[PDB]
Amino acid sequence: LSTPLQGIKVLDFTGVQSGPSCTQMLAWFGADVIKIERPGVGDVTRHQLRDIPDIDALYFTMLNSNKRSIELNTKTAEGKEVMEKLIREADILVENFHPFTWEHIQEINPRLIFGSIKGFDECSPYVNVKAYENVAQAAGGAASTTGFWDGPPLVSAAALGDSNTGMHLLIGLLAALLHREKTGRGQRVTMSMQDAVLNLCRVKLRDQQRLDKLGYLEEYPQYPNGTFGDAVPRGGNAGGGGQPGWILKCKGWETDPNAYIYFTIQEQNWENTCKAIGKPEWITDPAYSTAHARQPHIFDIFAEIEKYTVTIDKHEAVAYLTQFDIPCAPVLSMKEISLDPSLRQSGSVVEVEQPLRGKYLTVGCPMKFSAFTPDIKAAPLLGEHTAAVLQELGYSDDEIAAMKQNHAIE
Amino acid sequence: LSTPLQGIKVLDFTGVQSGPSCTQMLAWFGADVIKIERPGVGDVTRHQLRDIPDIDALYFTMLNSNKRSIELNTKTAEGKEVMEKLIREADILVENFHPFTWEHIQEINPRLIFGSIKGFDECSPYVNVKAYENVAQAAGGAASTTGFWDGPPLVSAAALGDSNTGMHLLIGLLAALLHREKTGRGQRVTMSMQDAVLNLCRVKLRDQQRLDKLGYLEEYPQYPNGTFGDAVPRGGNAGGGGQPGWILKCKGWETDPNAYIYFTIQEQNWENTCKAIGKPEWITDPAYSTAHARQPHIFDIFAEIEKYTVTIDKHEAVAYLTQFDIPCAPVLSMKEISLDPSLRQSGSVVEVEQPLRGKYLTVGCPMKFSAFTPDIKAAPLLGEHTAAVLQELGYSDDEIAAMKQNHAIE
To answer: What does the entry list as the binding residues for substrate (chains A, B)?
Structure first.
């Protein structure tokens, strides 16, 4: 009967993934999101990585559910007029362009919130450098600290520079809406891809300061028989926090790249872990009884657990080990996730009917609310809503026809 | 003169990283965040990974800036009474416990928003399984798709299961505050670590569907001379989207694990890339002139670029290549980030004075606002605000003294 963003109007210039992920969520929260697209071309994701000739790619449909699409040429007298009318009516304008002024917009509409995503902050030496996903992962600390100590920096499959940056801009936009309830004014909100990556790497900045102070990191694989340099090193599949763990092979790993589990050695669970793996002697042995004592031979311990896990299927391994309250889970493949019934039931993976394509899967709205449920719908066809939007703005049918004709002739 | 969450009152039961990251942001947006801690012990991060004996760890100070701390024993008659008074006054209650009912809370305070983080959704077969960071990375798709095709699943340094889950809960809480402006009611908001990871891996679900349809992924390293299985494979340092790229060695890589850059081959920038690397012949050569043509020998191309990058310092490499509008950046180490002047100027890395410790660095508020600037402050000492909070609740000095005495005796 009501949604959080009921009545909110968004002008959405975003493309690719960072900005569209943000505005897709705005739409799912009830906002009217109008994608303003280049006539005859549209968002680049419509044409990238297509699996079916001549129809919008999955890259597009999974990021643009529930949006409206207009085609608009701002470089004409009528396009500029349409743009001004849209700005007067809008609550939020969002853009994520590579490197109508804000001053003018404020004068047109002092209630408007302007959201902008860039690769880097305004004062960065890299302010004018184009960033894609992995460029941000490199600049933000993640590639440096992900991977193995004897291998290269490694990018993460997770969209640390793209969807993550979108989620951070979304936080800012919702805060700005809340602030507007108090001030009656909009404002500018900016978010950089580098900063989004850094925020998720906060704990690696913790580790850099520990390393600066002490010269070693007790819980890292390099302690005590390896070497530390001046910067936090890659730790392979180490825990990353106060509880050690590792990725362990399960039955079938020679041919199945996802036949593995993650296993945590939780400090407060040590006795239960010992019972699980048939090592009751390790409950009181001073070399094993505390985390500090375990650390210098922690890989011998993981090797002992792996002697068991390699003999059974990962799902069996987790079923057995969790009886002992061990934090662990299988490494789920994208195929397993795409078919998991619980993720359908939770609305985490959602089937959507798309015009011209038929069914596709998307990731749904991740957080759950007791007072409303988003209804996830198809993505817009290019320019599907141009006429409807112009009508809502007060243009007559003859005026709309004239605009379309002028465009066709130009 | 005003902040977005001015006057909002938060009761914060969270510990470790997911929940505290969320409520730290609430505090930075102006909310009063009261951490409710176990007497004599407090949040586990106070004592984990310490670098200085007997004072709060950096793990704690970098996640609990600007909060208040009370020590409260809910298992006594007076503790339950304090708890009820706090709930009556609060806007938001947040918890992230491992696996006062909601029904009762709604009756006490129909305006209260209750936020909860768990490892898994309520209908998951894993609902009762403990999750740490990397357990969620395994269950959410990220470990499966991160790393190399001939190596194990790999965890990301970025806190995909922890701070990322916090940011998603934060989105939900701000949406619920906006919804409350319309309904006059609070609600429950829930977020799972598995779902947070999956949301950042949306593009790998795109790829799984493409793979299901076609049997290959044209832009992955395995095309065309490798093999595809049933699930999206690890792609090493591949682009992840519509623009190919790779991590390339720079001068010093034999001894410096961060002597590398990320380099993107941007489709619309191919001629400029050719000019950059001294290969004008590749502008019109049909084997190189289009992305489709480049893909089968893309690693020969990266090898040619690396013949240049290996000869100069990464920062020199980026200075040269960006003149040609190539999207690229150095792999910045945590040491470089910790000292970068631009990140201080932008408020992305922030120096804070902590009682008993002195100066530490934290990651600041990532998004920037034109209408307010957060002031990032010290973390609370354990129980620092117990008396102040009890006074605000209307307890007399004699009552507070009696509560402290009763506790000391018990």
So the answer is: 241-243
